[PDB]
Design a binder for this molecule. Structure first.
Ligand SMILES: Cc1cc2nc3c(=O)[nH]c(=O)nc-3n(C[C@H](O)[C@H](O)[C@H](O)COP(=O)(O)O)c2cc1C
Ligand SMILES: Cc1cc(Nc2ccc(C(F)(F)F)nc2)n2nc(C(C)(F)F)nc2n1
Ligand SMILES: CCCCCCCCCCCC[N+](C)(C)[O-]
Ligand SMILES: O=C(O)c1cc(=O)[nH]c(=O)[nH]1
Length: 362
């Protein structure tokens, strides 16, 4: 506790006085040099979950955009998370938009950003992930922890499909899953090309899987797609059908929104909003896609999750796992420890045997 306590005092201080992205990069640096706290607790066997044959030791991970370049994977995971989604990465490095490009509102526990997909590029991030996988072989606390890779297109790309293909051929061997972050017909083409290129990694290697997939599952990465919440009902239906036709392994609901306008400090700011003001929107979106897909597509929840209650709402709506981002900014390093306990107590109060029982109850 005192390690978490001292750090969360420092974090509250940083939140008040210091620029967001500067703060973010400082703590990533602290994590890189391994002086952040550990959650070495055993996670409840009743809160374990899965997406098909991908097994999560607990239902909480860190969303994409937090550690874009995979420089801090060990330390973030050891805060008590079961998985992390690095990226979004692009084939070539991008600077992103002009700074400052991230702003926080403590009162509403919300964030707005216009980063513009800044990242070191696929080559550098692949090497970062490779080094992590090597460390993981030797680190007890990283056993069975999952790393997904969010992939996207370069800002001025000629061909989206071959941007994703480039990334998959580079980093796919080291990923437990791939998250696509980008029209229904166009999406179908993207999804199938990704599945095909992952299937080709298996073909063009002479090694058995144990020595081919240098990841956690020792199997080929699953394919998820992340959806933005700013769509009409027809677009959601169209997308839903595509996700069924393509037999995609899961869907991440959701990314940031642009339809929040009741935050004063953000009134003259451009970008996508996350945090508490996104919670209700993203939850409704989960129910909708859970319906439109007839519950055949596992869901990864993202948007305004801060508490065990928030989490159980996402789950009862249809989600199998939850991702945090804003929670770590406002609640600090105790976030995983705190929210895991709250969910466990709640699952008991509501009289659930395990977490899997609660999925899609409402
Ligand atoms: C600064 C910032 C950068 C982000 N970068 C990415 C990204 O690169 N790829 C992605 O899929 N989502 C990105 N996101 C969206 C988050 O992954 C997440 O979906 C969103 O913040 C909602 O979660 P939350 O309400 O818990 O913060 C980013 C969000 C923020 C605030
Ligand atoms: C205090 C603080 C800490 C922090 N980042 C942070 C919080 C917790 C952790 C850790 F728990 F993983 F250590 N790491 C980084 N961020 N990130 C942003 C933003 C919105 F600009 F991205 N603002 C932040 N403010
Ligand atoms: C305001 C500064 C806060 C100081 C926090 C105290 C430092 C504890 C960090 C030790 C982390 C150790 N370990 C072994 C988990 O890495
Ligand atoms: O890098 C960004 O600007 C970004 C990407 C993304 O997927 N979502 C978001 O809110 N910002």
């Amino acid at each position: 506790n005192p390690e978490f306590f001292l750090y969360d005092i420092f974090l509250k201080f940083c939140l008040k006085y210091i620029d967001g992205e500067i703060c973010h990069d400082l703590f990533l640096l602290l994590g890189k040099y391994n002086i952040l706290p550990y959650d070495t607790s055993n996670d409840s066997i009743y809160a374990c979950t899965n997406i098909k044959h991908l097994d999560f030791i607990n239902p909480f991970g860190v969303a994409a955009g937090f550690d874009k370049n995979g420089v801090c994977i060990d330390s973030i995971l050891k805060l008590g998370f079961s998985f992390i989604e690095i990226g979004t990465i692009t084939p070539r490095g991008q600077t992103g938009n002009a700074k400052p490009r991230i702003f926080r509102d403590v009162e509403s526990r919300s964030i707005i950003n216009s980063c513009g997909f800044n990242n070191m590029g696929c080559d550098k991030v692949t090497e970062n992930l490779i080094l992590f996988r090597k460390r993981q072989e030797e680190d007890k606390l990283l056993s069975k922890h999952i790393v997904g890779v969010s992939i996207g297109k370069n800002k001025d790309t000629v061909n989206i499909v071959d941007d994703l293909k480039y990334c998959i051929n580079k980093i796919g061997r080291y990923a437990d899953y791939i998250a696509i972050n980008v029209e229904a017909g166009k999406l179908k083409n993207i999804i199938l090309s990704v599945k095909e290129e992952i299937d080709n990694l298996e073909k063009n290697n002479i090694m058995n899987d144990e020595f081919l997939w240098f990841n956690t599952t020792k199997k080929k990465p699953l394919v998820f797609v992340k959806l933005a919440p700013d769509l009409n009902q027809e677009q959601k239906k169209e997308i839903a059908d595509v996700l069924l036709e393509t037999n995609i392994d899961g869907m991440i609901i959701s990314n940031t929104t642009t339809q929040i306008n009741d935050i004063k400090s953000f009134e003259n700011k451009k970008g996508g909003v996350s945090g508490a003001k996104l919670k209700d929107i993203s939850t409704k979106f989960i129910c909708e896609m859970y319906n439109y897909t007839n519950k055949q597509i596992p869901i990864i929840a993202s948007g305004g999750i801060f508490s065990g209650l928030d989490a159980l709402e996402k789950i009862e709506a249809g989600a199998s796992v939850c991702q945090l981002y804003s929670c770590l900014v406002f609640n600090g390093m105790k976030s995983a420890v705190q929210i895991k306990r709250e969910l466990n107590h709640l699952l008991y109060q509501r009289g659930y045997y395990n977490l899997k029982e609660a999925i899609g109850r409402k």
